[PDB]
Amino acid sequence: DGPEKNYEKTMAILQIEAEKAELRLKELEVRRLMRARGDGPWYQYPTIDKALIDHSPKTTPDN
Amino acid sequence: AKTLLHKYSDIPEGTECHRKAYASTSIGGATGLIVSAYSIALKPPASFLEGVARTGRYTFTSAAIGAIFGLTSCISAQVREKPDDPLNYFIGGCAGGLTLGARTRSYGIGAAACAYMGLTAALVKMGQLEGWQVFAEPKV
Amino acid sequence: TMMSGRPGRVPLQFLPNEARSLPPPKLTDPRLVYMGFLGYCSGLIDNAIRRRPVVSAGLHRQLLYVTSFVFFGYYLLKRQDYMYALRDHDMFAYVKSHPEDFPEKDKKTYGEILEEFHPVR
Amino acid sequence: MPLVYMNIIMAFAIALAGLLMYRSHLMSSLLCLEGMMLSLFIMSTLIILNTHFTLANMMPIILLVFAACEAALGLSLLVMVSNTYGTDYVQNLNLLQC
Amino acid sequence: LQYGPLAFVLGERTTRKLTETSKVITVDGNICSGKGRLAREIAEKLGLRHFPEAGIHYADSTTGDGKPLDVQLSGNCSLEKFYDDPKSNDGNSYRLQSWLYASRLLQYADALEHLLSTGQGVVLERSIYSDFVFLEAMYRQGFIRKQCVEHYNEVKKVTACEYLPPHVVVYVDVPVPEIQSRIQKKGNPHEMKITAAYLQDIENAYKKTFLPEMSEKCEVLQYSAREAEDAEKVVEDIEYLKCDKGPWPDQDDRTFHRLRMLVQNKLEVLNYTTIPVYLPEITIGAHQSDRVFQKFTELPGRKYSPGYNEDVGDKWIWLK
Amino acid sequence: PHGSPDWLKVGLTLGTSVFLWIYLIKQHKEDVLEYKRRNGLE
Amino acid sequence: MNPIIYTTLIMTVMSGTMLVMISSHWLLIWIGFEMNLLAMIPVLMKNFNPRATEAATKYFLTQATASMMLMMAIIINLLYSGQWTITKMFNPVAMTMMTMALAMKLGLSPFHFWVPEVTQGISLQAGLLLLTWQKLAPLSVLCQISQSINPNLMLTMAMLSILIGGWGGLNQTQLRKIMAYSSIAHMGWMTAVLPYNTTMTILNLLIYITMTLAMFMLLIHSSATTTLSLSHTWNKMPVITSLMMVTLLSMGGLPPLSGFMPKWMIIQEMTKNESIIMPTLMAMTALLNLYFYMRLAYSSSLTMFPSTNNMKMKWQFEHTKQMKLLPTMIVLSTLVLPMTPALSSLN
Amino acid sequence: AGRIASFLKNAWAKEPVLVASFAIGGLAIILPSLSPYTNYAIRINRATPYNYPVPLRDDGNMPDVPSHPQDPQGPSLEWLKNL
Ligand SMILES: CCCCCCCCCCCCCCCCC[C@@H](O)O[C@H](CO[C@H](O)CCCCCCCCCCCCCCC)COP(=O)(O)OCC[N+](C)(C)C
Numbered sequence A: 001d002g003p004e005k006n007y008e009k010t011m012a013i014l015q016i017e018a019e020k021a022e023l024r025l026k027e028l029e030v031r032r033l034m035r036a037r038g039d040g041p042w043y044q045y046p047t048i049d050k051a052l053i054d055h056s057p058k059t060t061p062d063n
Numbered sequence B: 001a002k003t004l005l006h007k008y009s010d011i012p013e014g015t016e017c018h019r020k021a022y023a024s025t026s027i028g029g030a031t032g033l034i035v036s037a038y039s040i041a042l043k044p045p046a047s048f049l050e051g052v053a054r055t056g057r058y059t060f061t062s063a064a065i066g067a068i069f070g071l072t073s074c075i076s077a078q079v080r081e082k083p084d085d086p087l088n089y090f091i092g093g094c095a096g097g098l099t100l101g102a103r104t105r106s107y108g109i110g111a112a113a114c115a116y117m118g119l120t121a122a123l124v125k126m127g128q129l130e131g132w133q134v135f136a137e138p139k140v
Numbered sequence C: 001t002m003m004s005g006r007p008g009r010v011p012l013q014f015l016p017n018e019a020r021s022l023p024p025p026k027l028t029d030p031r032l033v034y035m036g037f038l039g040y041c042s043g044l045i046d047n048a049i050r051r052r053p054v055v056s057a058g059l060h061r062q063l064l065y066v067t068s069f070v071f072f073g074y075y076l077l078k079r080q081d082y083m084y085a086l087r088d089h090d091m092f093a094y095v096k097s098h099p100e101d102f103p104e105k106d107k108k109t110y111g112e113i114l115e116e117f118h119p120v121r
Numbered sequence D: 001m002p003l004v005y006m007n008i009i010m011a012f013a014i015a016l017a018g019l020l021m022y023r024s025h026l027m028s029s030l031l032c033l034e035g036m037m038l039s040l041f042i043m044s045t046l047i048i049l050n051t052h053f054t055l056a057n058m059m060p061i062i063l064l065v066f067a068a069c070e071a072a073l074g075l076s077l078l079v080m081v082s083n084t085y086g087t088d089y090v091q092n093l094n095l096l097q098c
Numbered sequence E: 001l002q003y004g005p006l007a008f009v010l011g012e013r014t015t016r017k018l019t020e021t022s023k024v025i026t027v028d029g030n031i032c033s034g035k036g037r038l039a040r041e042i043a044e045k046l047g048l049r050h051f052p053e054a055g056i057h058y059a060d061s062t063t064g065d066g067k068p069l070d071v072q073l074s075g076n077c078s079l080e081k082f083y084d085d086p087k088s089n090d091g092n093s094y095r096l097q098s099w100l101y102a103s104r105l106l107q108y109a110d111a112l113e114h115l116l117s118t119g120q121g122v123v124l125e126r127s128i129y130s131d132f133v134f135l136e137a138m139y140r141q142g143f144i145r146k147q148c149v150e151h152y153n154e155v156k157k158v159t160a161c162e163y164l165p166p167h168v169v170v171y172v173d174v175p176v177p178e179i180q181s182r183i184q185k186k187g188n189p190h191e192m193k194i195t196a197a198y199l200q201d202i203e204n205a206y207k208k209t210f211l212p213e214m215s216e217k218c219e220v221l222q223y224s225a226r227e228a229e230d231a232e233k234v235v236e237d238i239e240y241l242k243c244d245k246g247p248w249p250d251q252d253d254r255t256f257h258r259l260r261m262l263v264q265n266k267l268e269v270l271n272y273t274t275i276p277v278y279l280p281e282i283t284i285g286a287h288q289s290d291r292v293f294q295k296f297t298e299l300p301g302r303k304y305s306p307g308y309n310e311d312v313g314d315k316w317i318w319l320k
Numbered sequence F: 001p002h003g004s005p006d007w008l009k010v011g012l013t014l015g016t017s018v019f020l021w022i023y024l025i026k027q028h029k030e031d032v033l034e035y036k037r038r039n040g041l042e
Numbered sequence G: 001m002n003p004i005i006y007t008t009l010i011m012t013v014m015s016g017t018m019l020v021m022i023s024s025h026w027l028l029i030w031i032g033f034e035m036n037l038l039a040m041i042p043v044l045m046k047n048f049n050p051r052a053t054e055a056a057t058k059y060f061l062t063q064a065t066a067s068m069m070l071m072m073a074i075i076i077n078l079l080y081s082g083q084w085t086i087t088k089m090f091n092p093v094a095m096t097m098m099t100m101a102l103a104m105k106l107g108l109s110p111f112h113f114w115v116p117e118v119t120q121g122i123s124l125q126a127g128l129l130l131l132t133w134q135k136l137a138p139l140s141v142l143c144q145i146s147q148s149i150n151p152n153l154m155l156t157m158a159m160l161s162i163l164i165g166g167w168g169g170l171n172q173t174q175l176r177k178i179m180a181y182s183s184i185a186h187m188g189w190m191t192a193v194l195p196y197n198t199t200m201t202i203l204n205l206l207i208y209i210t211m212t213l214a215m216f217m218l219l220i221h222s223s224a225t226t227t228l229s230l231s232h233t234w235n236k237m238p239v240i241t242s243l244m245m246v247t248l249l250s251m252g253g254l255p256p257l258s259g260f261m262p263k264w265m266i267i268q269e270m271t272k273n274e275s276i277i278m279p280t281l282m283a284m285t286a287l288l289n290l291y292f293y294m295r296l297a298y299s300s301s302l303t304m305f306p307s308t309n310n311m312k313m314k315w316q317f318e319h320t321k322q323m324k325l326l327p328t329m330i331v332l333s334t335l336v337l338p339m340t341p342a343l344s345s346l347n
Numbered sequence H: 001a002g003r004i005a006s007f008l009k010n011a012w013a014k015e016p017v018l019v020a021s022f023a024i025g026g027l028a029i030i031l032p033s034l035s036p037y038t039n040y041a042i043r044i045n046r047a048t049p050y051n052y053p054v055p056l057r058d059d060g061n062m063p064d065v066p067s068h069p070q071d072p073q074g075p076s077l078e079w080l081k082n083l
């Protein structure tokens, strides 16, 4: 075939790989920040559910 | 614990040769005691006296190796006037291997220990310079 | 990543409802073909172990192996695609919600950037 | 942390050391295990009663039951060993080696 | 539905089928005795099933066609060569002895499987027990070495520590000159080369060791040449005695199930007959083993599983 | 041994394979229809 | 034993493991461990003999000590924070003691001594169950509290386990001891990535379970315990020896076989956390596992050892009992590298 | 029917203790689900005051809550007294 086919195929491939590399760097940074802080959906370790607490008079005023 | 490592690391590399030698001797003695305890637990030789002789010889060998390594490394660092150079640690490691060979009394162990201890000491110095991590914290 | 504690997660659901918002894998997917190939290999090995004509001992058994492998492969591919979509969605949402930690790089041109040149001699 | 808890943990550690020393008489090993269990029972009972954690009063009894079951199991094994050797010395179990 | 743990779980209990008539019996005698004739009569009268003595080609009879295979493919030994050259340099004596012992072990396993599956008893010739007398005769005469009998003892103990000894042992006693005359009358060209010392060693190895060992745990019926002709008295003696000293009364449904699982699946039965001890008489080089196995595979019904042979005539191959 | 082709097992295996294939085809069709519905393609 | 009793004991073992995995209370987890230990002992003693009894008593002693240590750790954690839920340990001493308890249960060095002897004494079937099924409860518990475990202790124990498994596997001749040391080394590999990513731990566990199930089923199929008994196999079922050699190559970490997937992936994860020296050390150590696997392959399939005459009779009989899932196990343990990304299923 | 009766007759001879034990156990298992007094036992257990009854704060929209113990509103234990 002609050179334009290989030229444009290489251009598309280069775009795909560059986007993938940038996405991988962003993923690593996001993971590091998320584990360090814990304010995102990832790395949310469970805590005690508050629906288990009994809110009723307890035979003693001071709980 | 980690107190002995802190004592060794607090001293500057190019000064206080005697204190460095004492810290290295303490570390070597601790390692010798641990390995002697393991050997005693896993292989009770014949009695109490042979056991105490074995633990004494192991601890003395390890302490001598550590003392020689520390003294030689610090002396080389001072004399060369070039601190933070892994070459000093390489010389210290080879000297320690040489004393290990002399204690075991065979040239093969002496040469192999010189090579494989100078290499390890140089790698440790390089890691200390570049901040290499052995037990890395869980970043990501 | 540890998406185990992700909020609003059903404890024992293979495929959540939102996973239906993604395109299902094609039936001619190369990975599905690979699962079919694995099933065929399992059939051939089963024939070999039992000391039977390897190629043509049990056609029904080989067909069942292939079909089971394709079934499990299809569902596994759906779950994998859903999980990767979740990861990308969380990534983009977090990078949008924290602009301070991901500043826009000041775009520069190679003309005004000095890179050291090391000749090869 | 008062001295009672410290003494109980010291007792548990002493019993563990006795179990791991292994002079002879596997029955002594079982006795050391059950001493560790008794120390666990005492410590758990004190902790649970001190804080008035009412629903946790079940925990010691349950514990004891299970542990006693294990003891029974252990005894059975010991018996078989003796029935194969005539005595329960620990050093006789040396057929298998690393 | 072949027998298995599931069948035992639902219905298959083997203690119901035993009806006091099983009474596995082994008829043992000296070479060229009347025991074979006697064994057949006992099985006929008692309603049991007679198993002919296991030979070189016994295993070939139970697998595939009953027609025996080539000597090279099954046994690699011959009895006539043993009679002609007992001190053969190529170790034929041990190879014959081991092949015969393993064949007898397979026959005993088959007999036990039949007894447990059906409940009808069996009658046997020389079993795995009493087979050691031929080994002792060979060793004392100098045919085989000491390492030979050591390996045989190891294999025998490992294989026989898992089977129930027979209920009744029947022994036919014939004096050495009488059996020598019988051998001369037989006319088999190789058999008159049997030395009298060999037969004497067989007989005294029978009497000194095997008989007391069977007596201490089982019932022994020592019969002379004349009194063994009348099978009626033999059967009456069999009925009259009661078995209460062996392990058979102590067996239960679970132990019988374990034994029935062991007797079938012949690979486990023969598993320890090929222990990796390298005696020059039994070991085979890699090239010889490869060539012989390749030649074995080219047999008509031996390339694939029993039901998957096209040349034999099995059809519907692609749907089995 | 002397075994004929067990038609029961063969029938069960063929039925299982055919049922699994039909179920997979139907599930794929429903999944693509649901995806096109959710994304507003068709 | 009776088949019904054996089935009941197996159900009880599985129920104990399930109770450990699905429970959110420390007491219930301890109860599950006790039930598992209680029902697991007769499985070792199914074939009664002195070796089985000694192995069972060693296993019982080790497991009972581990359970007592685990309960003491639970008690201390409750003392310093009145919480029963399995979460952050809230105490360093309790975490250390619980880590030792779970190491004893798993078999990580220096608590590894019991594994080779227990595997050697007990049968192949018992060994297969012990090697793969037992690991699931302690590994689940460790995964549930991975955010609190001290990286130094876990990492040094994993490194020691890899070293010990690699060194001890070289000397052994019996296949069961080789499998025990292989399990020790694989668990050293698998527990090293716990502080970083538990998904890699689960993936390595699944791959290791598949590989060891395939290898144990192959060893049961050709009833061989020592190396020479395995060398004799080629004369009867060469296909079994070939499949076993392929599985052994897979278990050594050779690409493109499936056994390369975990190690590689695990290394990748420890490279994300700037841990470089340790993955290199564990790779050069796994070279020893590869060496003794290669020696076994040389003995088994790649060369033809001398046979025995009686083996001729074994040519005429076929394997009466066929174990299902063996071909599937072999295929899953050999040719699943191209589907590596499926690990995102959080398996 | 006949076989079951014959088996029960056989067991009542030469083994009466087991028959009595099984009969008593079966009766103890079965009967409580049929007795009409079990709800009475539950109500009696519920009516025993172990803790102090904490009064509610009045907001003008509690007609079912009595303002005094003597007031007719509230649960009554006349059914227990009649028992
Ligand atoms: C060889 C590789 C391993 C193969 C393993 C055997 C394959 C057959 C298994 C059959 C299906 C497995 C599970 C059955 C489906 C129903 C169970 C389902 O509900 O479980 C879900 C989960 O599904 C399973 O986890 C996924 C199973 C898929 C395993 C294959 C991955 C292997 C990756 C590399 C090999 C590629 C595949 C090769 C061919 C199979 C629930 O997840 P969740 O309760 O919320 O999270 C629990 C885990 N946590 C606690 C860590 C968060």
Ligand SMILES: CCCCCCCC/C=C\CCCCCCCC(=O)O[C@H](COC(=O)CCCCCCC/C=C/CCCCCCCC)COP(=O)(O)OCCN
Residues within 6 Å of the ligand: H008, H011, H015, H018, H019, H021, H022, H023, H024, H025, H026
């Ligand atoms: C569902 C309720 C269960 C709970 C109630 C019972 C709890 C406690 C009672 C049971 C304790 C364990 C019982 C163990 C049973 C073992 C059976 C056994 O093996 O014994 C047989 C003998 O027992 C039998 O005969 C079989 C069972 C006997 C009868 C079982 C129950 C019969 C029916 C019970 C209900 C009756 C009908 C109700 C009538 C209601 C009134 C009109 C063997 O006799 P040996 O003592 O060993 O020999 C010594 C002499 N050589």
Ligand SMILES: Nc1ncnc2c1ncn2[C@@H]1O[C@H](COP(=O)(O)OP(=O)(O)O)[C@@H](O)[C@H]1O
Residues within 6 Å of the ligand: E030, E031, E032, E033, E034, E035, E036, E053, E079, E096, E097, E100, E101, E131, E134, E135
């Ligand atoms: N272990 C053995 N070694 C050598 N020969 C054996 C062995 N077992 C059986 N035989 C041979 O089997 C033949 C038949 O045995 P025998 O009962 O004496 O003759 P018959 O069957 O006519 O009654 C004998 O010629 C005997 O040599």
